[PDB]
Amino acid sequence: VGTFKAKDLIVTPATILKEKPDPNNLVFGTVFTDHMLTVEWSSEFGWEKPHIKPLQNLSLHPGSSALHYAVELFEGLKAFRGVDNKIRLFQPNLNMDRMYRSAVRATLPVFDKEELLECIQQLVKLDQEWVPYSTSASLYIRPTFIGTEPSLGVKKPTKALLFVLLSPVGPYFSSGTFNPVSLWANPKYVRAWKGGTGDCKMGGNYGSSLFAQCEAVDNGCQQVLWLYGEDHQITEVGTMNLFLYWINEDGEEELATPPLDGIILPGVTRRCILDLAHQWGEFKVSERYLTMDDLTTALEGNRVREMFGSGTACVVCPVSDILYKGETIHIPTMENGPKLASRILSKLTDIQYGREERDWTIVLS
Amino acid sequence: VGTFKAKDLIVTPATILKEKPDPNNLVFGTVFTDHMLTVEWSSEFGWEKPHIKPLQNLSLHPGSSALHYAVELFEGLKAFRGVDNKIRLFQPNLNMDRMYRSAVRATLPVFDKEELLECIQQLVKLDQEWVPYSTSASLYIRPTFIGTEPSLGVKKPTKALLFVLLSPVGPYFSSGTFNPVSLWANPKYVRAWKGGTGDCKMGGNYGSSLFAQCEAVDNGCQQVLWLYGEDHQITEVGTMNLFLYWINEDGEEELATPPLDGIILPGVTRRCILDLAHQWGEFKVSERYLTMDDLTTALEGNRVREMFGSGTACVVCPVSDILYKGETIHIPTMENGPKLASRILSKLTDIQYGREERDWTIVLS
Ligand SMILES: COc1cc(OC)c(-n2c(=O)cc(C(F)(F)F)[nH]c2=O)cc1Cl
Ligand SMILES: COc1cc(OC)c(-n2c(=O)cc(C(F)(F)F)[nH]c2=O)cc1Cl
Ligand SMILES: *Cc1c(COP(=O)(O)O)cnc(C)c1O
Ligand SMILES: *Cc1c(COP(=O)(O)O)cnc(C)c1O
């Protein structure tokens, strides 16, 4: 055991710098900054000194376990250029907690979370001009941890690479205003199972998801509604946690989300939304199981107000439509404002871009 | 939608050749040959011309979907230097069928199966001296298909690499004659689920498996017994299909294996063993569900003869012991010969090394 340390950072500035993109015409994860973080690991010598250096291709042995046995995990967090032109990270300690936990579950070697965060701060600081000059755009931070074991043996890797990429991203839909998603619901496909890795951000979870995603796009849907179990539990909306704002069976007004029972990725946005709803104390907040039957029963009873997905990329993604067993189930999210969705988006946006102070934000070192 | 063609092969021989290893001191997937196959793909231009060239590191964009979203699959088949010094592939068309099917499920681009097989034949032919001069050793062939999409966008990859590695491998256990495995049975972990990709050889299935494998090694076990469902179905023995030779509940002598209901990798060895057992017609052959309760009930009734795993790496791996609910359940496989296990290994070995003729073997082009 041990860790790489930020104070040992070897910075190799780029001699040639790239023109930044137009913040208004940005496709997600397409454009990359001048520099990246890389840290080598071996079982023999442990963590090498971390490097900030020019963005380059990785030279990987073709037997690298990341390519064969998906010995890999990632994270998604953002840096935001605020209204006061100060750059802020948003709850980055929750990403470090989740990446550590993912590393343990992948059997990739542990590291000091404070040392990674500080290494990421230095990377964003070097490339701080890539944090878009726009109140509707952000720098996407992609920490990645891959096994580079050069053997086809299925085992704990004896070699690993931890690297970070920065990618400037614009608003979720390039129109800026709310574009509601249609969800493809086919229970033939299952994202995660009890005793699986669904509650970790491990690459394996996404490779298996990709067929259903393409099947969704074919039928005019943007995301997959992930169903689980005999009773068709609604779990996640694609790459996002699932929120339902409704009148519940007891007749109380309720914000409901599936509980962290192993098949749900504990999202940062999900945490923040639950924290806000609790704090406001205006309606019942329930981590509880939701079925398609629960949802359709409520729809014919006009009890559904809003449904939305939460995640680092979209923050709040309203749901208008679900395609399930060949019928098109409409969700009246956009006909109800969407009131709660708009309030959450505005609250999180205000915090991220420094319009109000919060413990959730850290100004860049 | 098209394909690369064997007749377009661009061969770049190596100017410096490596010394072959001692077949008696070979760890699995550790040592690699002089050359590899590489074929580039793009959505724009389609399949580039295939290349046989010196074994080298892959230069990959750090955003490659194989590293982030485990957009990857592999295969495992062998070349065998026979008793007549002719090199044979073993049912390689089943590997091509299974790799194609896996490519469709991963949303990686399709290819002509005959053209891949012929490209692999040419690769093995160039490196044919790496096929060990040993009747107990083989050349492991690792076709690999990875998404090289340089964007963090979760979608069908617009760029891919299909590459093949050759690795000389020794006998299954390095002490030659049968060394039985002890299995770690902990139902907390689940390899595959209904609606998953367990019946495909996609990297994601193995990344998730790795924690249970390390937990097994900790408790002196070599493989994991993968349990599924309320009733604890025995599904696979680690990276191998599960065979049970026993007296069944009706008192008939039976060779039983879990059925291809979505959570079982349809193994080539599994297919061949079922085909042989059917052909012999000496006992009942049942693709049917096996539970830990079924197994323990049969053990206390002295109805269990042999249990073994099947797969390209081991062929037949006898099981002596299962660690389950803290106790050590002994399996009398080694006290019963193992009769059937030894007969299967000898039949498959005879076919692979050309001691008897079979439709299952192809002599190298
Ligand atoms: C040292 O004991 C072993 C343990 C193994 O897994 C735990 C394997 N093994 C396979 O059986 C199959 C594959 C795969 F997936 F490539 F087919 N890869 C492997 O490492 C081989 C040996 Cl010799
Ligand atoms: C509107 O089109 C999109 C569709 C998406 O999922 C298909 C995503 N998307 C990612 O691509 C990656 C992640 C992550 F980071 F979790 F992997 N989360 C996301 O929502 C982003 C956009 Cl902009
Ligand atoms: C990343 C992710 C989320 C949302 O996590 P955030 O930290 O809010 O971005 C939800 N579901 C899955 C499957 C995810 O991978
Ligand atoms: C590869 C594999 C097998 C065996 O397949 P073969 O073609 O016989 O090598 C069995 N189970 C799993 C999970 C596998 O990945």
Side-chain angles (χ1 to χ4, degrees):
Chain A
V1 61
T3 180
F4 58 89
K5 292 164 153 72
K7 57 202 175 75
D8 292 316
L9 265 166
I10 299 161
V11 187
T12 304
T15 52
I16 304 158
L17 267 37
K18 290 176 292 202
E19 288 199 29
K20 277 79 176 178
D22 178 340
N24 305 309
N25 296 113
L26 266 171
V27 186
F28 180 88
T30 300
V31 173
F32 297 90
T33 66
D34 295 316
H35 304 92
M36 68 193 299
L37 182 70
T38 61
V39 205
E40 290 286 358
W41 182 87
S42 60
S43 65
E44 196 180 27
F45 299 118
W47 283 110
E48 297 305 318
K49 292 181 152 70
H51 290 248
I52 296 165
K53 73 191 181 177
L55 179 74
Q56 58 194 240
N57 283 2
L58 307 176
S59 193
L60 296 181
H61 195 290
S64 300
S65 46
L67 304 174
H68 296 271
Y69 309 125
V71 179
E72 66 185 45
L73 60 94
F74 67 101
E75 265 303 337
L77 64 155
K78 284 179 163 182
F80 303 90
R81 187 178 293 286
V83 294
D84 65 349
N85 198 51
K86 290 216 189 86
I87 298 161
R88 286 178 185 80
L89 301 189
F90 181 81
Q91 297 256 239
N93 288 301
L94 293 190
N95 300 93
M96 299 297 92
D97 291 351
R98 189 168 69 194
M99 196 177 176
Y100 187 98
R101 195 171 55 78
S102 294
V104 168
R105 190 61 177 73
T107 80
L108 282 162
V110 292
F111 53 92
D112 193 291
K113 291 182 286 187
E114 297 300 328
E115 297 292 346
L116 210 217
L117 183 44
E118 182 50 29
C119 285
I120 291 169
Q121 306 232 229
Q122 289 306 314
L123 205 219
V124 171
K125 194 208 178 194
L126 218 197
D127 280 354
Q128 66 172 282
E129 292 311 302
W130 289 91
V131 188
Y133 284 89
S134 175
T135 200
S136 72
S138 50
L139 190 59
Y140 191 65
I141 309 165
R142 172 45 65 84
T144 321
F145 206 176
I146 62 166
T148 55
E149 179 60 45
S151 91
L152 308 189
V154 175
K155 73 222 196 190
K156 204 160 161 80
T158 71
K159 284 210 76 208
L161 212 215
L162 162 38
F163 66 94
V164 184
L165 303 179
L166 308 174
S167 167
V169 299
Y172 183 73
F173 286 105
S174 27
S175 50
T177 59
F178 271 147
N179 285 359
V181 293
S182 299
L183 307 186
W184 181 250
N186 185 1
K188 177 170 180 206
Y189 306 107
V190 175
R191 196 192 74 79
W193 198 265
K194 302 281 166 67
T197 58
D199 59 356
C200 293
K201 228 164 176 75
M202 289 173 59
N205 299 334
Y206 304 91
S208 296
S209 302
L210 211 40
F211 194 85
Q213 179 64 35
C214 287
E215 192 173 86
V217 170
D218 280 356
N219 307 305
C221 296
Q222 288 83 84
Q223 301 273 346
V224 175
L225 178 58
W226 292 108
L227 302 177
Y228 172 80
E230 293 280 9
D231 53 357
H232 304 295
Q233 291 185 173
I234 68 186
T235 67
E236 303 229 24
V237 32
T239 45
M240 291 172 284
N241 295 120
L242 181 158
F243 280 97
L244 187 67
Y245 181 48
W246 75 334
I247 311 307
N248 70 17
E249 297 92 344
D250 300 339
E252 293 153 332
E253 185 184 312
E254 194 175 64
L255 185 58
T257 192
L260 303 183
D261 69 345
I263 64 166
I264 310 300
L265 196 290
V268 174
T269 325
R270 175 186 181 282
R271 175 77 278 119
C272 294
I273 289 167
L274 284 173
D275 284 357
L276 288 172
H278 285 313
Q279 181 207 318
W280 298 338
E282 299 172 22
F283 46 76
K284 192 175 183 157
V285 187
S286 308
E287 302 189 56
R288 64 100 102 196
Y289 298 112
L290 299 165
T291 74
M292 283 301 293
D293 278 345
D294 292 341
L295 178 61
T296 52
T297 294
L299 277 168
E300 74 191 48
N302 292 112
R303 284 163 44 223
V304 177
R305 298 275 175 277
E306 303 169 39
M307 188 191 296
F308 54 90
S310 78
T312 298
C314 186
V315 182
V316 177
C317 259
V319 176
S320 61
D321 295 291
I322 304 175
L323 280 60
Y324 179 58
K325 302 152 76 66
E327 76 179 70
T328 293
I329 303 166
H330 181 75
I331 318 297
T333 301
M334 298 315 279
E335 291 88 55
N336 283 298
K339 272 194 69 54
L340 184 60
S342 301
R343 180 178 175 182
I344 291 162
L345 175 61
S346 195
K347 190 60 171 196
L348 291 174
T349 294
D350 281 2
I351 293 163
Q352 282 162 355
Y353 290 98
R355 272 191 269 262
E356 69 159 81
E357 289 180 319
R358 205 75 213 245
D359 296 338
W360 290 355
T361 56
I362 307 178
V363 175
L364 205 74
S365 319
Chain B
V1 52
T3 180
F4 58 89
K5 294 177 156 72
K7 58 187 174 77
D8 292 317
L9 266 166
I10 300 162
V11 185
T12 305
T15 52
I16 300 157
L17 267 36
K18 291 176 296 200
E19 299 189 29
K20 277 81 176 178
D22 178 26
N24 283 47
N25 298 114
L26 269 171
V27 183
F28 181 88
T30 300
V31 173
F32 296 94
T33 66
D34 295 314
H35 304 92
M36 68 194 298
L37 182 71
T38 60
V39 205
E40 290 287 356
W41 182 86
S42 61
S43 172
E44 197 184 333
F45 298 119
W47 283 110
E48 297 305 319
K49 293 183 187 82
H51 290 247
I52 296 165
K53 73 191 179 180
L55 180 74
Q56 58 193 239
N57 282 8
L58 306 177
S59 194
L60 296 179
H61 196 289
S64 299
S65 46
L67 304 177
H68 295 270
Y69 310 125
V71 178
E72 66 185 44
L73 60 94
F74 67 101
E75 264 302 337
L77 64 155
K78 283 180 162 181
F80 301 88
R81 187 179 293 287
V83 294
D84 65 349
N85 198 51
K86 290 218 189 83
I87 297 162
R88 289 178 183 80
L89 299 193
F90 182 80
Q91 296 256 239
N93 294 299
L94 292 188
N95 300 93
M96 299 298 92
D97 291 351
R98 189 168 70 193
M99 195 177 176
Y100 188 100
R101 193 171 58 78
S102 292
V104 167
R105 189 63 171 75
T107 80
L108 283 160
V110 292
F111 53 93
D112 193 290
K113 291 181 286 184
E114 296 299 325
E115 298 293 344
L116 211 216
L117 181 44
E118 181 50 29
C119 285
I120 291 169
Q121 306 232 228
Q122 290 306 314
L123 205 220
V124 174
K125 195 188 157 185
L126 219 199
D127 280 355
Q128 66 172 282
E129 290 314 301
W130 289 90
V131 189
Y133 286 85
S134 173
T135 201
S136 73
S138 50
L139 191 59
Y140 190 65
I141 310 165
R142 173 44 65 83
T144 321
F145 206 174
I146 63 166
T148 54
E149 179 59 44
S151 91
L152 310 185
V154 176
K155 89 286 203 168
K156 202 167 195 137
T158 71
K159 289 204 76 222
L161 213 209
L162 161 38
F163 66 94
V164 183
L165 303 180
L166 308 174
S167 167
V169 297
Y172 337 110
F173 270 78
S174 26
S175 35
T177 59
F178 273 143
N179 293 344
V181 292
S182 301
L183 308 186
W184 180 249
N186 183 5
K188 166 167 184 149
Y189 303 108
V190 175
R191 196 191 76 79
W193 46 95
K194 300 280 177 64
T197 57
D199 59 357
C200 295
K201 228 163 175 76
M202 290 172 57
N205 301 334
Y206 304 80
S208 296
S209 302
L210 207 47
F211 194 91
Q213 180 64 36
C214 288
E215 194 174 83
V217 168
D218 274 10
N219 299 254
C221 295
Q222 289 83 84
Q223 300 274 344
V224 174
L225 178 57
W226 291 108
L227 302 179
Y228 179 77
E230 293 275 28
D231 55 354
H232 305 298
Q233 292 176 181
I234 69 185
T235 67
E236 302 228 24
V237 33
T239 44
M240 291 170 280
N241 295 120
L242 183 158
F243 280 97
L244 186 68
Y245 181 48
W246 75 334
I247 310 307
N248 67 18
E249 297 92 345
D250 299 340
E252 295 158 321
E253 184 184 312
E254 194 175 64
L255 185 57
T257 192
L260 303 183
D261 69 344
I263 66 167
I264 310 301
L265 196 290
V268 175
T269 323
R270 175 186 179 282
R271 175 77 278 120
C272 294
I273 289 167
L274 284 174
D275 285 355
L276 290 171
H278 286 315
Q279 175 150 29
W280 299 336
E282 298 174 23
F283 46 76
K284 192 176 183 179
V285 187
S286 308
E287 305 185 56
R288 64 100 102 197
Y289 296 112
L290 298 166
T291 74
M292 283 301 293
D293 281 341
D294 292 341
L295 180 61
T296 51
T297 294
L299 277 169
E300 74 191 47
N302 291 111
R303 285 163 45 222
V304 176
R305 299 274 175 276
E306 303 168 39
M307 190 193 296
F308 55 89
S310 78
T312 300
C314 186
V315 183
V316 176
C317 258
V319 176
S320 61
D321 296 292
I322 303 176
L323 279 62
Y324 179 59
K325 299 151 133 193
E327 68 170 66
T328 298
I329 304 169
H330 181 75
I331 317 297
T333 301
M334 297 316 279
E335 290 87 55
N336 283 296
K339 186 185 190 198
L340 183 59
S342 301
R343 179 181 176 181
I344 291 162
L345 176 59
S346 280
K347 189 60 173 200
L348 290 173
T349 293
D350 280 4
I351 293 163
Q352 282 162 356
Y353 292 97
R355 273 192 267 264
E356 69 159 81
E357 295 204 22
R358 204 72 213 243
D359 300 337
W360 290 356
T361 56
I362 305 181
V363 174
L364 251 218
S365 317

